[PDB]
A paper describes a structure:
CDT is a member of the Iota family of protein toxins which also consists of two homologous toxins produced by Clostridium perfringens (the Iota toxin) and Clostridium spiroforme (C. spiroforme Transferase, CST). All three Iota toxin family members are assembled from two polypeptide chains termed the “A” subunit (CDTa, Ia, and CSTa) and “B”, subunit (CDTb, Ib, and CSTb).
A map of the CDTb trimer was refined to a final resolution of 4.19 Å. Although the nominal resolution of the final map is lower than the initial reconstruction, the final map does not suffer from problems arising from preferred orientation as is apparent in the initial map. The model of the dimer was used as a reference to generate a molecular model of the trimeric intermediate. We note a similar arrangement of Chains A and B within this structure and the presence of a third chain, ‘Chain C’, positioned next to Chain B, opposite of Chain A. As observed in the dimeric structure, the orientations of all three chains are rotated compared to the assembled, symmetric heptamer with an observed rotation of ~40° about the central pseudosymmetry axis between Chains A and B and ~43° between Chains B and C. The interface between Chains A and B and Chains B and C mirror those of the dimeric intermediate and do not indicate the presence of additional recognition elements. Interestingly, a helical pitch is also observed within the trimer wherein Chain C is positioned ~4 Å out of plane when compared to the symmetric structure.
Author numbering:
A (entry chain A), B (entry chain B), C (entry chain C): 218 to 315, 319 to 451, 457 to 748
Amino acid sequence: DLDTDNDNIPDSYERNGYTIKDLIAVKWEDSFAEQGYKKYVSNYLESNTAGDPYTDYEKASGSFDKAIKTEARDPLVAAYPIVGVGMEKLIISTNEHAQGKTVSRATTNSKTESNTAGVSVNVGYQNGFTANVTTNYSHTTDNSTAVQDSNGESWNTGLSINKGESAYINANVRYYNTGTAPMYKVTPTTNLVLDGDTLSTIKAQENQIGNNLSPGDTYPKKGLSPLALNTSRLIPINYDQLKKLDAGKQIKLETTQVSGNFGTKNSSGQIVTEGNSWSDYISQIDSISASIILDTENESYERRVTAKNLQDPEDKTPELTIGEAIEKAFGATKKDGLLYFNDIPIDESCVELIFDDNTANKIKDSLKTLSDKKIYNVKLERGMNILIKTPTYFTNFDDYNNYPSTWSNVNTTNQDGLQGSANKLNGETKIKIPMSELKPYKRYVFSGYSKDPLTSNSIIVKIKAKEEKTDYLVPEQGYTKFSYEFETTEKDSSNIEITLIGSGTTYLDNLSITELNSTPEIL
Amino acid sequence: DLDTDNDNIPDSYERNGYTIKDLIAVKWEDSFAEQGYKKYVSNYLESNTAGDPYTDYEKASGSFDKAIKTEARDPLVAAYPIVGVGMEKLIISTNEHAQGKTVSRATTNSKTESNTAGVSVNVGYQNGFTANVTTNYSHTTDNSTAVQDSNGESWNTGLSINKGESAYINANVRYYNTGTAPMYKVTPTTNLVLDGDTLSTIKAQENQIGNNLSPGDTYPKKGLSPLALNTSRLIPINYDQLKKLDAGKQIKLETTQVSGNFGTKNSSGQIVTEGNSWSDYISQIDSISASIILDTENESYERRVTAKNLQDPEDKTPELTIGEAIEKAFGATKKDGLLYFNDIPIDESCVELIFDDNTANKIKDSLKTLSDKKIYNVKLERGMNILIKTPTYFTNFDDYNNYPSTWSNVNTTNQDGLQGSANKLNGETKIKIPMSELKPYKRYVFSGYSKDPLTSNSIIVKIKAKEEKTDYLVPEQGYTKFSYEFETTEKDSSNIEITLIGSGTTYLDNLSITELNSTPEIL
Amino acid sequence: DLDTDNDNIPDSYERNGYTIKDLIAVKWEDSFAEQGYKKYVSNYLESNTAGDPYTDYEKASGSFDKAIKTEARDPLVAAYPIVGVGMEKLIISTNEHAQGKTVSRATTNSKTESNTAGVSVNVGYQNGFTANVTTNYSHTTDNSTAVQDSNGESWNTGLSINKGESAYINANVRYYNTGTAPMYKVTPTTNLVLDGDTLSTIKAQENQIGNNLSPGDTYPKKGLSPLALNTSRLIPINYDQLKKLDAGKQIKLETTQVSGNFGTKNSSGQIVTEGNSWSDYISQIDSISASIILDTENESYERRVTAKNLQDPEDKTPELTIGEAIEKAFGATKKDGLLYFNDIPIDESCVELIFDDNTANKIKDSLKTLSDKKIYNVKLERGMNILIKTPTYFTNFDDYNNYPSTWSNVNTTNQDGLQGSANKLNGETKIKIPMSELKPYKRYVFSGYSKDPLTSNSIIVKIKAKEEKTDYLVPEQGYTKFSYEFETTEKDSSNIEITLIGSGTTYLDNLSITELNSTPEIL
Ligand SMILES: [Ca+2]
Ligand SMILES: [Ca+2]
Ligand SMILES: [Ca+2]
Ligand SMILES: [Ca+2]
Ligand SMILES: [Ca+2]
Ligand SMILES: [Ca+2]
Ligand SMILES: [Ca+2]
Ligand SMILES: [Ca+2]
Ligand SMILES: [Ca+2]
């Protein structure tokens, strides 16, 4: 009944209960949780919960831009715009205006490549920390390029450079947005950096892209003509960096400064975008919120969620766990003990978790006092980053199985599993996968969980690839997570085999195969 | 009941008790110092205790820009933004448009080099003075570049400059903000100098740095590619300073004018950065407050703290000691006679303290009248500069120890130390520190405390390095600080030996290895 | 109770006493002189008692711009900012772009030299005039250049100019303030004058400095690089003034028009520096107040003080003596008959006094009626000039003794002196001040005081340098002041010795060696 800020919601209704229906507010008592309403938690000392250019009421009632994704309806998630650039096809030509020698290659893009390229994986997880530590960190602003149609052939012999003069570089790019915010006056700048030696900067101005970029969309609408670097003209190169591109290095294409406008609803009609810009709220959002990234193999997402700092009892901001923040940022359905997306389950054992050194140290220090030793029950703190990687293949010996092949010697008849059932081991367990279903020249990690109700039972696991290896595993009464890496090669090679031999008592569950990054090719 | 300024704070409270909770002001009754609540002190004759454009009650209540660091909510420390610029790597090319001969070297930038370069060392420290002096004083505005990847070769061999015509220089620079204040419309003017001779200046304008610079964050957000000086275009060089650069001197950068605005709330809604400027409060802050700089091996900070004019009893402003100023300006947990950060310990006998000549004369005048003979229990006066250097290696034979190796023949079972334990001696004390963990071409100070309740039980020390020496240290009844210096070379040498032997009675404590400056390399 | 001006202070409290506490005026009764309180007097017929744009209550209550030095707190001293430009490095280039024959020399600036460059000395100082007479006056605005690092070589040798065309000049400059006021919007216009001929006018606009120059703070803040004039650009020279610098003349720099703004606190918040100009108050101060310039070996000071016109009984204004005017315009500590700074002594017999011819005539008119024979007890009048030059060396055989070389035959066992003791003489008196501290190509004056309690005891003095001089002196009953002059030469000369021989009865006191100006050099 008491009001502090300039919002219709009372200060008592800004904590421990929040329901918005027919443009008024009513208290939640847990009767209509199935009827399409979710619980909002917000500040009650400040009008603006996060740094987005809206009040808490307008983003909790739908009276804002229709282009904004609906996942930012909760007041702890703000509309933060990100503009990313992807590189698709490359051509090399010896002229400047546009005869000569022109060569063309196709190239795939990887958004979450530089983040996980500095991840070293050990053979054993210490205590309840079921994650890895990266070396460096980066958002999806930068992008990585991998050459697919790379037959053994030097790039020099197709261009005939002798001593000093080198050709030019032309390409096609696409402009995507990974976040819950559009941009209207899109003016980005992008550096084309090859292993540190900067080549050029690209500014696409305004008229070439148009007055909008809706979230989740690019300018080439799905499958159409990609935008080339012809229509600020062409990029040169010298006779020092071509061998670097040929042998080991890949072209980095990263967006540096992003400027634009947006829309706020006026009193009368449709949107306005003239006297307002995205230039002041970058540090207003980025200095109070964390950064949660999710990487499905088809598309990626990033969100920013406000957090709580421990050394300020006067700051009465909402406090969440890790899993609650994931649920509110990404949108999920709560099943019995589990959190689901539309088709991909989300759990501390079903996907992979990546943190930097500060977050890893904070989680290791904060997991001492808890008595459950689970990842999702970690208190949210500001200034940390989470990268969730969805496996490209995952089975849980249950209703979900996306493996293209079928396993051998599978015994579903068990009930002492971490989630449901498990496989009773008696002898061999073998699977093979053809090379065509896996992208060449990458790095894969195969991970799983094991349990043994004996003293000194042991398992051996053989991974047959272009570096085949055999490894030894000694499980105990507790659940043990194992993870082993392997490398792939070109499509003209053999299949990939996964075998494991035991003594006939252990149990296995939660099998996953996940791609991380790309390996250099000898060229 | 009584009021003096245009603020909400009562007059009878404003001295010796001050607490903000739930946007109300209550006195201090020294019973909730453990729940995170803290006290502050403010002048009662003016609304702005410091020189910032925020009132003290507002800047202590949190109703201000949230990107400012949370320890700046102390009203006794003002917000002051500092912009620094420095190289990462350097290139020379003989063409104005970009073939020819091009060389590239990789450098490292350092923040406190010109300040420490005028500091001399001695065998003993007379009286209670536990600090050194510097020839000239500079802030962290200027940066020094050190060239690492450089074997024996002159720049002329890779350039072939004969009589007068020289090549062109280009560099990769970064911009950083080490202070408790952001700025938005950044317009830095930077002189790129070689030992006094200004080669040129650069004006970054707006399109290359961006409309934002968060405090504590560089221009590339954490790890991205460094900006190149290709987007006013190029700067020249002649064949007079090339060999001068070759022999002894290094390129320095300093900014001169930094223009920008500060952000604040409007009457109704969002924040505006239009009708403000960070150019009218620089002198008004610098002519009222002190200057305290801290330099950790990872990062650096500096603050301006207001002081009391002792020769003016009318100016009713609160007074400070040195340790209380450090605690209130940086933010530190106060253990029993101890100031701790999250991991770095600071005390009067664990760090290095640097003043200039005027502060040295003032502290020598004010030290004799004190009955405790310590550095921290000194009243703060305006217009004096303090620098604190945290050593890269430091131990006290206690809970804190981060040496890359382990000390030999340690008898820590003792209590007669400055803080608990001490190193009893019966035989030698040796360490062989390897060069793989130390920066090449540096100057290092070995510092420590010696004490012995005996007549003349002297000790001797031997430092084996590229400049090897032996020294004799005699003890006293008092507690004597011993400091010595040595120099190092490139990474392809043998280990550095520190050996000390006495006669089985002396006590040695608080052993520290720190770095000062860079030596000119012969090339 | 009775009020005249726009101040809360009554007319009676505006005379013979002025104390302020808790923003309330109170009268002086001589019990709180030792508690830091100071006594002022102010006009009671105008709101602005001085020409600075502040009323007496506002300039005495501290509620004004804090960058103004505390010496301007009293109402009888005006806030007058002065911008001076100094030249440090002279480089000559024969091109209009940047290749060519370039020569770079180092040069030191002298601020107050031309005001005292035309002074001549006398053997005896007649009557009670213990000062000197100058031929021209100059502020700290003009500045002179003196070249030290210059071996035997013509400037034409480094340029090889034959008949018709000479090179271009380029300079390194610094900007300083010496006054009790800051200006923000600096507009410096300067002329580079060469012995009556104007070479060029330099206008450094707004962007080469910015809107901040603190008083007493150089634009390169303490130790940084000198600012070159390469950021309106170039200055030519002919083959007529190029040979004039070789023999006798020196390049001089004189600012002509400077304007700025003074910052005023508004009603509610911060300070405004837009609607203002430092052009309507220059003639308000300069046409009323006098001029006092003080020259220390480390810094210079300039102040303007309002005086009394003796031919005006209607003009009711404060009347000041010379010593009280100095004490109010600088801030002084009063020992028993003595005026001291923190360490620099100032007195009628401890420094050098320079007066203009009109001022000397007025003072010599005023000296006859005085019955005390002291120069500091003279009533001030509008439009007179005072220069106080502190000698670089000064002894009095007392608490202050800062000669680097000790005397010979020192007998301090005496008490019939002007202050404290006097040096008893028995035979010769020797001093040998060496090469290592004397600035070259300068002119020095050694002055002293003598008594002799005998009828016809004469003394002899010898000054041995490259230009030696002998002299015979006859002292008298009272205090007699004598002054001698000499010059110096380059580094490769010998040390300078001073001998004085008496006969055992004469008494010598207050020996002061000072520098006056610079001599032309043969080259
Ligand atoms: Ca509210
Ligand atoms: Ca709210
Ligand atoms: Ca299961
Ligand atoms: Ca107050
Ligand atoms: Ca106040
Ligand atoms: Ca200890
Ligand atoms: Ca009055
Ligand atoms: Ca008055
Ligand atoms: Ca005396």
